[PDB]
Design a protein around this ligand. Sequence first.
Ligand SMILES: Nc1ncnc2c1ncn2[C@@H]1O[C@H](COP(=O)(O)OP(=O)(O)OC[C@H]2O[C@H](O)[C@H](O)[C@@H]2O)[C@@H](O)[C@H]1O
Ligand SMILES: c1cncc(-c2nc3ccccc3n3cccc23)c1
Ligand SMILES: [Zn+2]
Length: 282
Amino acid sequence: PFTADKGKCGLPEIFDPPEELERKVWELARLVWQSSSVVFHTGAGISTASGIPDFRGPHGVWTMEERGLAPKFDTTFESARPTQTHMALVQLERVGLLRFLVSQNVDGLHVRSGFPRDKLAELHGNMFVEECAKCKTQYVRDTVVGTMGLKATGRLCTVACRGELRDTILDWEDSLPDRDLALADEASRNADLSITLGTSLQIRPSGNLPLATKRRGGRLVIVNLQPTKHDRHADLRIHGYVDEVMTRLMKHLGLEIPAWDGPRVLERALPPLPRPPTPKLE
Ligand SMILES: Nc1ncnc2c1ncn2[C@@H]1O[C@H](COP(=O)(O)OP(=O)(O)OC[C@H]2O[C@H](O)[C@H](O)[C@@H]2O)[C@@H](O)[C@H]1O
Ligand SMILES: c1cncc(-c2nc3ccccc3n3cccc23)c1
Ligand SMILES: [Zn+2]
């Protein structure tokens, strides 16, 4: 816990140059077009552009701790806005181009963006969510739940129960939530394309799920500023700011990045919207 292995922290960033970056984002569009079933895997890197520091980046939480410095937040969790990347993922699910979203972030932003919780696995918890120890009912709150480590928050269940509400933030010893891990693993195994965004992939099992997509000849794209644990397994690695990669990708796909209405919770995915017709790929 004080000696929990924090992994490789502070590795140098890589920047694909402008013409290489454009070529690679064209190739990602091409893979999205060809794929039947696309799964996204997100980590802390997708939220850095909203003021939330990552873990293992040059100014990440664990990196700065290793140097005796403090991470810096430019927002609260409550005042954080979803990024361009978050909103792109919203739109991709609505047009049917994303099948499932697996995230390691506890920041609450995928939920707050309006992304449907039945297409989302939150592998490490959500700081806005508490759960009834008795009936298992989850409550998505407007403020951060004040505890971590699956502790009693002090509130009680209101289902038509009085069970003790607990946080969903996993500590180092806690195993992953069974439902989320099982759904994420099924999606990952059946996917023909997994795309990783702002994750160094160092944590197991979360970081290993994209590799499951490889198993029946699926493709793996990694989008990240630093090296990741599974770079040698990638069919494509794009080294660039995720918001720049995702905006360009959406432009290639013919999709707008939709407006954020403010914090909204969608339980169940809506029926799919029209999408552009697909290019001929020779
Ligand atoms: N704007 C950006 N664009 C592209 N890449 C980015 C950006 N910002 C940061 N990065 C990269 O984004 C990556 C973020 O990697 P890590 O910090 O390891 O976060 P995780 O989500 O994989 O951490 C997994 C768990 O480990 C923890 O203990 C928690 O429990 C986490 O849930 C870095 O490589 C950055 O280069
Ligand atoms: C996402 C990105 N960077 C840092 C966190 C984080 N900040 C936390 C801040 C204070 C209290 C507990 C926290 N905490 C407990 C699990 C994770 C966190 C989340
Ligand atoms: Zn209950």
